[PDB]
Every structure is written in C-alpha cells, then in structure tokens.
C-alpha cells in the first residue's frame, strides 16, 4: 500500500526524530510510464 | 605505485568515466501544466 511505502524509515535524526519516506516524497499508485496519453472520444482510455 | 594506485582503481575509473548515462528529459512526463520545452538531457557518453 502507499501507506506502507510512506512509513519506510529513511533516517533517524540527531535529536532522535524520524525521517520517513513520506517526508521527502509523494506516494501514489500510478503508471509505469507517462509518454502516451490515450483518449477515446476525448475520454481517458486503455485498451487491448 | 608512484601514485599509490592499482589496476582496481584504473578499472573503477574507466567504468565511471567511460559511461553512457541515462539522464531523463527537460519537460519529461508526467509534466507540469504549462510546460513549453521538451528536450533530452545528455550526460556522459562513451569515449571514442
């Protein structure tokens, strides 16, 4: 889940505070790449 | 020996300095709204 990725622990600071992955990044389910925009009659589409 | 070096360091320097680097693009996808420029970033290339 995105939540589990966000709480990956990057670092523990000097004061003992925690740097989590969600403190340096946005996290979302997305595509493997974004070069192609596909639309069928102007609506988002996929296909086979 | 005169420079405190070995074949290990030579091999490491060749792998690092005779490299072909995948560097992404200016304006790459997914892009920001309003982007006007798309161009490839060209970093290190194989020596010739």
């Amino acid at each position: 889940s995105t939540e589990e990725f966000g709480k990956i622990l990057l670092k523990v600071n000097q004061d003992g505070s925690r740097v989590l992955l969600r403190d340096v990044a946005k996290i979302e389910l997305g595509g493997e790449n974004y070069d192609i925009i596909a639309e069928f009659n102007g609506q988002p589409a996929s296909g086979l | 020996n005169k420079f405190q070096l070995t074949p290990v360091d030579v091999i490491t320097a060749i792998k690092a300095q005779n490299a072909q680097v995948a560097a992404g693009q200016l304006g790459g996808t997914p892009p920001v709204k309003g982007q006007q420029l798309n161009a490839s970033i060209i970093a290190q290339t194989r020596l010739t």
Binding site: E3, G6, K7, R18, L20, R22 | -
Partner: protein, 156 residues
C-alpha cells in the same frame, strides 16, 4: 494434548458450533492447547467465530490463556478487528493490559491496524494508554507512525 482435546481445537478453528457444543457435553478440555499454546479460544478469536467464543467461555474457558509467546485471545481479536469478540472477552474478565513476550498489548495491536472502535472499547475497560512495548512505543507512537490522525486524536 489427548483424545477429545484435538477434536475441539479443530472444531473451534473451523467454526463448527454444534460440534463444539457436543464435544463440551462429552467432557472435552476447554483449555486444550496445541504446540504453539493456542486454546480453542485463541483459535475462535483468530478466525472470528463469535458464537464459539461465547460457548467456550460459558463452559469455563480460560479467558486469559497465553500462547508460548505470551499472546492471549484478546490480542488476536483486537489485532484482527473482531469487535464483538473483544467485547465478549472483556465482559468475561479478559486482562485488558496483558502483554506478550514483546511487551505488546491488545491496544498496540488494535492501534496498529487502525481498529478505532476496538481501541475505544479497550480504553473504556481500562487499557493503559501509556503502556510501552519492548522498544518504548505506545499506541500513540503507533498512530502517528501510521499517520492515522483519527486514532492519534482519540489516544490523547
């Protein structure tokens, strides 16, 4: 274990209520435990068989049986969201502050999976909100690590 002990364990795990009742009537040990120390109550709490939990408790099941790593049926029910079973267990005297070998309490477990309603029940029954596992962490620490803002509130 022994004879009718094993059939009760598998009966409680499978959720076979009539057979649980029959094995009770035949003198089966309510507190028969398998190799890892799970009783029928452990099994029924884990798999969420509310009626079997009641029948086992009505028949004198240890409500505070612990497995070989110190975990009780309340831990299991609180961890896997079985709210009605958590209430039945607490009503029958389940130690709301029981700790396993890791210092982990039913409140930690319920908090870690975000079961807000279970957390309120456990608090209502006297859960120590400042209880710490072996790493010094509280249910609150768990809440903010999970980014669960609702939980984080409830846990002061």
């Amino acid at each position: 274990g022994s004879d009718l002990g094993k059939k009760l364990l598998e009966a409680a795990r499978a959720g076979r209520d009539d057979e649980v009742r029959i094995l009770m009537a035949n003198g089966a040990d309510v507190n028969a435990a398998d190799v890892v120390g799970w009783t029928p109550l452990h099994l029924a709490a884990y798999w969420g068989h509310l009626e079997i939990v009641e029948v086992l408790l009505k028949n004198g099941a240890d409500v505070n049986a612990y497995d070989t790593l110190g975990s009780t049926p309340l831990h299991l029910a609180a961890h896997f969201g079985h709210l009605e079973i958590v209430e039945v267990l607490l009503k029958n005297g389940a130690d709301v502050n029981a700790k396993d070998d890791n210092g982990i309490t039913p409140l930690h477990l319920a908090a870690n999976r975000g079961h807000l309603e279970i957390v309120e029940v456990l608090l209502k029954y006297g859960a120590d909100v400042n209880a710490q596992d072996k790493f010094g962490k509280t249910a609150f620490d768990i809440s903010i690590n999970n980014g669960n803002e609702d939980l984080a509130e409830i846990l002061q």
